[PDB]
Design a protein around this ligand. Structure first.
Ligand code: HEM
Ligand SMILES: *[C@@H]1O[C@H](CO)[C@@H](O[C@@H]2O[C@H](CO)[C@@H](O)[C@H](O)[C@H]2NC(C)=O)[C@H](O)[C@H]1NC(C)=O
Ligand SMILES: *[C@@H]1O[C@H](CO)[C@@H](O)[C@H](O)[C@H]1NC(C)=O
Ligand SMILES: *[C@@H]1O[C@H](CO)[C@@H](O)[C@H](O)[C@H]1NC(C)=O
Ligand SMILES: CCCc1cc(=O)[nH]c(=S)[nH]1
Ligand SMILES: [Ca+2]
Length: 595
C-alpha cells in the first residue's frame, strides 16, 4: 500500500443522491468512496502486479531476463502447441445454446474493458510495430516461433499494443502500473447507454421528449430498428466489405460490433429500451423525456442483472455457485464492486465456447438462404450481413437453436479465432486470440498460475506428477511443463482454462473461485441492485421476476417460436413453443396516478 492514488481520472463530479438513478460514469454509487466501480479508473489488484522490473515491464519483454529462472514461452507457441485444433467434429455442447456463449461476452462488456493503446494516428510508429515488429514503449509484438506457418505469410510477428494505464500513457516508476477499466464495473447496461455522459447523450434521442435511444435512419429490419452508425473512419466494418460500404454500430460499448451475433443482441437490447420508453409514456403520459429515459434505463438494467444471476451464472458456476453467490442479503457498502484486473482475463473462458460457424435459420428453422451457414471468421465486424442480408431474425434463431462449442483440453480455441481473427486497422483475417490473451496477461503484470491457485485456497502443484493430478490430463500437463517450465510461470488464462470443468458448470475450480467473488462483489456492492429495497417496489420486483430472453426476443423481433430456457440447448420444434406461452413483463406496477 503506497499513496492514495494516481492521476488521470476526472478530479471532481457530483452525486444528487436523492436521484434514484445511476450516474453514467458509475460515480456516486457509493457514498463512502464515490469513484468505486466508476468508469475510466484503474482495475482492482487482488494480488500484486508482477513485472521484470516490478513496475511497468511485462515478462518476456527482455530476451534475457527470465522469470523464476526460466524464459517465458512465446504466446504464439503455447497457442499452437496446446491450444490449437483442426477437427471441429464433436465440439458442440449438448446442453448449451449459442445464446449461452453470446451472453457472456454481453455481460463481459457491460462489466469491463481494458482500452487497448495505439496512441497517435499519424503513425509510422504503428508501421514499426507490425511491419518490422519493433519492441518498445507500448508496442509489444508477439513474434512467431520457427516452423510457424503464418511466418511465411505475415512477416515475423503479430503486432500487439499494451493496455491503457493510470497516470501517464507512458510507463512510470515508484508504483506498479495499473490498467484502466473504461466501462462501469456495475451490471448497469453501460454497454448500451455508455460510460461517458458525452456518449450517453449523443446516444439518446433528444429531438423528442420520448426518452428514446437513437436509432438508424438509412435502414430498418422490416419494421424494427437498428442502432445508429458509428460515424468515424476508418471503419473496420467498411473494410471487410468496401463494396457493401456498411459501417459499425453506435452503442454504449465501443466493441458492440466485433462479431455479428454481438451486434445482434446489442440490437435486441436497444429495441428493448425504446419498447419500454413507449409503454412508460402510455401508462405515465405525464413524465418528461428524461424520466422515460432513466426509468427504461433502470428497467433494462435489472433485466440484464436477472438473466445474468438467475439463468446464466448458475450453470457457468454450477456446484460452486451458492458457495460464492449465496442468495441476496443486502447492499454491503464495505464491499469493493470494482472489477479485478485478473477477472478480465478470467471471464474470457468465454472464448473457448465460441464455435467455428454461425447460421441464419428461416422461420421454420431450416437454413435461411443458400449460404445459410457461414464461417465465423467472416463475421468479425460484419454489419453488412445483417443489414443487406436477412435482418436480425434469422441470426436470432441460430442463437436459440445452435449449440455453443464445449470446452475441451485437446480442442480449446477454434481457428476462426486461433489463426483467423481480425483486428481493426489491420487488414488481415490472421490473428490469434489465444496468443493475444497470453501476451495480455503479461502486459498487465498478472501473477502466475499458482499465485492464483493459492489465493483461491487451492492446491498449488509444484511437479509434473503434481500437475497431471489436478487437470486430470496427463499429456496436457507434460505439454504445459515443456512449454512453461514450472506451473508457477504458466500464464493464468490458459492455466485457469486448462483445468477440467466443475460439477454442472463450464469452468475449472480456479475460475470458479475467481468469478465467484467478482460477481458476488458486483451485486453486494451495487447500491442500485434491483433486489435491494428502495431501488424497486415489491410490486415492481414481482414484475421483474418474470422476464426471459425468450420474451426479450418475442418483444423485439418477429420470431414466434422460442424455448422457455433460452440457454439449456433447445431443439426445434420439440423444445420450441409460441410467444404467448411465455411470461411477459407487466408494466402496470410502474404507472403513476397523478392525483
Ligand atoms: C471475436 C470474439 C468473441 C466471440 C466470437 C468473444 C467472445 C467472448 C465471450 C463469450 C466472453 C465472455 C463470456 C468474452 C470475454 C472477453 N473477451 Fe472476448 N471475444 C472475442 C474477441 C475478443 C477480443 C479481440 C478481445 C481483446 C483481447 C485483448 O487483450 O486484446 C477479447 C477480450 C475479451 C475479454 C477481456 C475484456 C477486457 O477486459 O477488456 C473478455 C472478458 N475478446 N469474449
Ligand atoms: C460485399 O458486400 C456486397 C454488398 O451486399 C455483396 O454483394 C452481394 O452479395 C451476395 C452475392 O451472393 C448477394 O447479396 C448479391 O448477389 C450481391 N450484390 C451485389 C451488390 O453485388 C458481396 O457479397 C460482398 N462481398 C464481399 C467482398 O464480401
Ligand atoms: C427521435 O424520436 C423522434 C420522435 O418519434 C423520431 O421522429 C426520430 O426518428 C428519432 N430520432 C432518432 C435518431 O432516433
Ligand atoms: C439442460 O439443462 C437443464 C438444467 O436446468 C436441464 O433441466 C435440462 O433438462 C437439460 N436438458 C438437456 C437437453 O440436457
Ligand atoms: C481487452 C478488450 C476486450 C474486448 C474487445 C472486443 O472487441 N471484444 C471483447 S469480447 N472484448
Ligand atoms: Ca457497467
Amino acid at each position: 500500500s503506497w499513496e492514495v492514488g494516481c492521476g488521470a481520472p476526472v478530479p471532481l463530479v457530483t452525486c444528487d443522491e436523492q436521484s434514484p438513478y445511476r450516474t453514467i460514469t458509475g460515480d456516486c454509487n457509493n457514498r463512502r468512496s464515490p469513484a468505486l466501480g466508476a468508469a475510466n479508473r484503474a482495475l482492482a489488484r487482488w494480488l500484486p502486479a508482477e513485472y521484470e522490473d516490478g513496475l511497468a515491464v511485462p515478462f518476456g519483454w527482455t530476451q534475457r531476463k527470465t522469470r523464476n529462472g526460466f524464459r517465458v514461452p512465446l504466446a504464439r507457441e503455447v497457442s499452437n502447441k496446446i491450444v490449437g485444433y483442426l477437427d471441429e467434429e464433436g465440439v458442440l455442447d449438448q446442453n448449451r445454446s449459442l445464446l449461452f456463449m453470446q451472453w457472456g461476452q454481453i455481460v463481459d462488456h457491460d462489466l469491463d474493458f481494458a482500452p487497448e493503446t495505439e496512441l497517435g494516428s499519424s503513425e509510422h510508429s504503428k508501421v514499426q510495430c507490425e511491419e518490422y515488429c519493433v519492441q518498445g514503449d507500448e508496442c509489444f509484438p508477439i513474434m512467431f516461433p520457427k516452423n510457424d506457418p503464418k511466418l511465411k505469410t505475415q512477416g515475423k510477428c503479430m503486432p500487439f499494443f499494451r493496455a491503457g494505464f493510470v497516470c501517464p500513457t507512458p510507463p512510470y516508476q515508484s508504483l506498479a502500473r495499473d490498467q484502466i477499466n473504461a466501462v462501469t464495473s456495475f451490471l448497469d447496461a453501460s454497454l448500451v447507454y455508455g460510460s461517458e455522459p458525452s456518449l450517453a447523450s449523443r446516444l439518446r434521442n433528444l429531438s423528442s421528449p420520448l426518452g428514446l435511444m437513437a436509432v438508424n435512419q438509412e435502414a430498418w429490419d422490416h419494421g424494427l430498428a437498428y442502432p445508429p452508425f458509428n460515424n468515424v473512419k476508418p471503419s473496420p466494418c467498411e473494410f471487410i466489405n468496401t463494396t457493401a460500404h456498411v459501417p459499425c454500430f453506435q452503442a454504449g460499448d465501443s466493441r458492440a460490433s466485433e462479431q455479428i451475433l454481438l451486434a445482434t443482441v446489442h440490437t435486441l437490447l436497444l429495441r428493448e429500451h425504446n419498447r419500454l420508453a413507449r409503454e412508460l409514456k402510455r401508462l405515465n403520459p405525464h413524465w418528461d423525456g428524461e424520466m422515460l429515459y432513466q426509468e427504461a434505463r433502470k428497467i433494462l438494467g435489472a433485466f440484464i442483472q436477472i438473466i445474468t444471476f438467475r439463468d446464466y451464472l448458475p450453470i457457468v458456476l454450477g456446484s460452486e455457485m451458492q458457495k460464492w453467490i449465496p442468495p441476496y442479503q443486502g447492499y454491503n457498502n464495505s464491499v469493493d464492486p470494482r472489477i479485478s484486473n485478473v477477472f478480465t482475463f478470467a471471464f474470457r473462458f468465454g472464448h473457448m465456447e465460441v464455435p467455428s460457424t454461425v447460421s441464419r435459420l428461416d422461420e421454420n428453422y431450416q437454413p435461411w438462404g443458400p449460404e445459410a451457414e457461414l464461417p465465423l471468421h467472416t463475421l468479425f465486424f460484419n454489419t453488412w450481413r445483417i443489414i443487406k442480408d436477412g435482418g436480425i431474425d434469422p441470426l436470432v434463431r441460430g442463437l436459440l437453436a445452435k449449440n455453443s462449442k464445449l470446452m475441451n483440453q485437446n480442442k480449446m480455441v477454434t481457428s476462426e479465432l486461433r489463426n483467423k481473427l481480425f483486428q481493426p486497422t489491420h487488414k488481415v483475417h490472421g490473428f490469434d486470440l489465444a496468443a493475444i490473451n497470453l501476451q495480455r496477461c503479461r502486459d498487465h503484470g498478472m501473477p502466475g498460475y499458482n499465485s492464483w491457485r493459492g489465493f483461491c485456497g487451492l492446491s498449488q502443484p509444484k511437479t509434473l506428477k503434481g500437475l497431471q493430478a489436478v487437470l486430470k490430463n496427463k499429456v496436457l500437463a507434460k505439454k504445459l511443463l515443456d512449454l512453461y517450465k514450472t506451473p508457477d510461470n504458466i500464464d493464468i488464462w490458459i492455466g485457469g482454462n486448462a483445468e477440467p470443468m466443475v460439477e454442472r458448470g463450464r469452468v475449472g475450480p480456479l475460475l470458479a473461485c475467481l468469478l465467484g467473488r467478482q460477481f458476488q462483489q458486483i451485486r453486494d456492492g451495487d447500491r442500485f441492485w434491483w433486489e435491494n429495497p428502495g431501488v424497486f417496489t415489491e410490486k415492481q420486483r414481482d414484475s421483474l421476476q418474470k422476464v426471459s430472453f425468450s420474451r426479450l426476443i418475442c418483444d423485439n423481433t418477429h420470431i414466434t417460436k422460442v424455448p422457455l430456457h433460452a440457454f439449456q440447448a433447445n431443439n426445434y420444434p420439440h423444445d420450441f413453443v409460441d410467444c404467448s406461452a411465455v411470461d411477459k413483463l407487466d408494466l402496470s406496477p410502474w404507472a403513476s396516478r397523478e392525483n
